């Protein structure tokens, strides 16, 4: 009946309204640390972080889980300042995502089980801040690291009953391998959330994941290159689809019957060091309402194309607090 | 007329016996801070160092350059408290090594060249300590962004003064493209140690480095699994020459007339996350006297084999002091 977060453990109802994917800072490990200056400063990149969920709690955003891992170069005493300046609840994630280093990528199965226990069970680094999610990513077929990632994932979840989130290249259909690799080490679907699945229209590979229990992430709404053709990098980066057609899934899934499975976000950042110089302006055009996005464009949009606000609540409150609640079954 | 350490500016003569491709700990950014019971416990890697440190010192050795980058997890202050207590003075390095994250491996050559500049002319984090030596690596031909990396440590050692030292895959021949990028850059041989190449037996390798200007690091001399024939992960990394062989480059370079361009170091380590589990303890059965292995055994080796003690001293102390001193030629 508690949630781990930045600040300590809260109650299920004081989660309120959760964005279940998104990053204070997309970096490297030790990144921050060594190159500080990259993002003007750690001061500035507070400031702007502060500033955003302001904004967002002032939509009605009352937790973020950040899905940044150890490579995403987590920072959680960064997301503890933020947290407690915002007055907005984070939760935060141990795993392993798509550029783990070297002392990660030769470690067993048991090894990396030990690690996220850790994390979840004593604390992150020094500072007894416990994890609330694990995180985990493929991009196609696994490699065989990323096989063993998902494996200690499964094994971590089913010792203290924190979920799963992951990343996908959701139109390689990288959750069916994810799935058979989870349900071969006995996890429970209502324990994972299939990420980035809102990068693909594909909905016999989103209905055979629902199908079976599985949360389906649809993560990044307002990820678009629409208007910026120009652009390779951030075309790359963020698709050619419309920020409406990314919406109009949660609309899809709905009517198919999964309202309960369904998981909304942003997956914004304030900092973005792993990918082009300068990414973090670009992707701040486009949206300029940040992790606000969802509640004050997704929701009014999903509301005039017939979506109860309900059903909306339901979706943003009652689901978050359901997964991350932590359970062995769901 | 200083070289910086991890407790400060020292002066060449206090430089003394000096080892010039050393680690503390060979791991990856961010990790000991976060999984540091793969050591053991901090505490017991420090104590491991600071015993080795120790015997080295009895033996004769008064600095190491720990070669350690961003992205071996340099550590600078367990380099700090480990130098404190042994009485050994502890050169650090910046620059790149052959695991750099993506937010490294998106920077331009100017970026780059911020990035190694901060750590020699500002400091390592927030720690003010500043870098004595930049290191790089290919394996092989060098990837685009190793090609950077080159040219930004060949940039930042024309402003500062501070050489540069390399791995290499030596029977590759990499060299001869690592030196190609430095002089197409304007940096002088004179700076530029490349180092891994006690792993060749190839003089017409080894001599078109040294002719040109090139300081040869063999840098290496006890790794061998001579002995380890059924272990696969040892005999790949450290190789099925003897450290005999090894050594024997040494005279072989002396008696070319490169006497004064030799370099020599155990390329040793105390704690070791970036490979196989287990690997240091394989390594520490294979060469008990760590670092103290170049006094202890490659110098009594060497004189009996006609080697005068003038040289020698002059390739461990003289030698080593011309390279770390800061200039544009040297
Ligand atoms: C919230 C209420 C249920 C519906 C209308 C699906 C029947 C969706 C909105
Ligand atoms: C130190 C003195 C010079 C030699 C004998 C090379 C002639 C090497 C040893
Ligand atoms: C830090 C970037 O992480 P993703 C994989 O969610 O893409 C923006
Ligand atoms: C940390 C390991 O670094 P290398 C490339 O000198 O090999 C032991
Ligand atoms: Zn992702
Ligand atoms: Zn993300
Ligand atoms: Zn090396
Ligand atoms: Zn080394």
Known sequence: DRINTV?????????????????????????????????GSRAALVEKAVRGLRRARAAGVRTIVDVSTFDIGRDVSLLAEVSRAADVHIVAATGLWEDPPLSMRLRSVEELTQFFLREIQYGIEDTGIRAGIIKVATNGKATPFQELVLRAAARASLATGVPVTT??????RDGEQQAAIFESEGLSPSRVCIGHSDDTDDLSYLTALAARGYLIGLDGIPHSAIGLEDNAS????????????????IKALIDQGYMKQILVSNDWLFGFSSYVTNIMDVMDSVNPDGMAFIPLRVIPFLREKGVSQETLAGITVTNPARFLSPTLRA
Chains 1, 2 share one sequence.
Do not use: D, K
Not at 167 to 172: F, R, V
């Open 167 to 172: 990343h996908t290249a959701a139109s390689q």
């Open 7 to 39: 600040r300590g453990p809260i109650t299920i109802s004081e989660a309120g309204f959760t964005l279940t994917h998104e990053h204070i800072c997309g970096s490297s490990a030790g990144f921050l640390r060594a190159w500080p200056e990259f993002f």
């Open 234 to 249: 951030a075309s790359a980066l963020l698709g050619n689809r419309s920020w409406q057609t990314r919406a109009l899934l």
